[PDB]
């Protein structure tokens, strides 16, 4: 049940072309689309497209997103990928491998809520 505005704004054919291109150009990184989960009470970020080292951990990526949204340490933040919260010890490369879509992007939503999308 994931809903990303990115997929409305950019058509699959062009997303896939970009994902192919960036995968080939940066073999040790993966392309990731990040958005706030629908209806969540967290700030939107200006940047939605992230080129992430494959060995960066999910936990390290959380730290970046938390910083960019200016969350206080005590504030909760959850990522959702295919409606599931990923483990912090996984690398972003592993998360990508198992979850990227057919356009070669991984889609990550962030939220203050522990359940996605409402």
């Amino acid at each position: 049940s994931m809903k990303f505005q990115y997929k409305e704004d950019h058509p699959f054919e062009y997303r896939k072309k970009e994902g192919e291109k960036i995968r080939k150009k940066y073999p040790d990184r993966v392309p990731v689309i990040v958005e706030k989960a629908p209806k969540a009470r967290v700030p939107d970020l200006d940047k939605r497209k992230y080129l992430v080292p494959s060995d960066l951990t999910v936990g390290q990526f959380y730290f970046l997103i938390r910083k960019r949204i200016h969350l206080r340490p005590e504030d909760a933040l959850f990522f959702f990928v295919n409606n599931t919260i990923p483990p912090t010890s996984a690398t972003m490369g592993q998360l990508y491998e198992d979850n990227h879509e057919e356009d070669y992007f991984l889609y990550v939503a962030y939220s203050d809520e522990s359940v996605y999308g409402k």
């Binding site: 990184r29 497209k49 080129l51 060995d55 990526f61 970046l64």
Partner: peptide, 10 residues
């Protein structure tokens, strides 16, 4: 529009 990727640092 078509933004550039953020190049996330290790």
């Amino acid at each position: 529009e078509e933004a550039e990727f953020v190049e996330v640092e290790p």
